[PDB]
Amino acid sequence: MNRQQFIDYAQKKYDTKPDHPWEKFPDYAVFRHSDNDKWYALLMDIPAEKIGINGDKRVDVIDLKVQPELVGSLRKKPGIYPAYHMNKEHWITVLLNGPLGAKEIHSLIEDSFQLTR
Structure with a gap:
């Protein structure tokens, strides 16, 4: 799923x-x-490096809130990384145009x- 398909699904x-x-x-x-006015999704275009993935390339990711007892297990899946620019015990960063279905x-x-x- 990409940046476009995402903003559309939300709409x-x-x-x-x-x-x-910003x-x-x-x-x-x-x-x-x-x-x-509570945020439930954070769409961002960031440098791949900022979330561990290498290559001098950018990536589009979305931050989602989850239950603290699931952050550990989710982060183990491919395509899901630690929350970027958000609280790590409550947020998750999913990589768009990635392996996650x-x-x-x-x-x-x-x-x-x-x-x-």
Whole structure:
């Protein structure tokens, strides 16, 4: 799943419009509820290095909130890394255009959504 397919899925399955809090980073986009304004998804374009993957290349990742007892197990899957720019005990960073399946990603997007309802 890529950057495009992601922002679209959010718009349809949640009717959420992407926000861009950072002026310096036009790409970084957050997804929150209209209720409590709580972020449940953080889309970012970052240097592969910042999350351990090598190669002088950039990557598109999304940060999702999960239950602290699942962070250890999830991070063990391929394509899931430690939370970047977010709290590591509560957040997860999923690599887009990566080995993680869109289905598995959709459910994680749901989990982060309900965890911040």
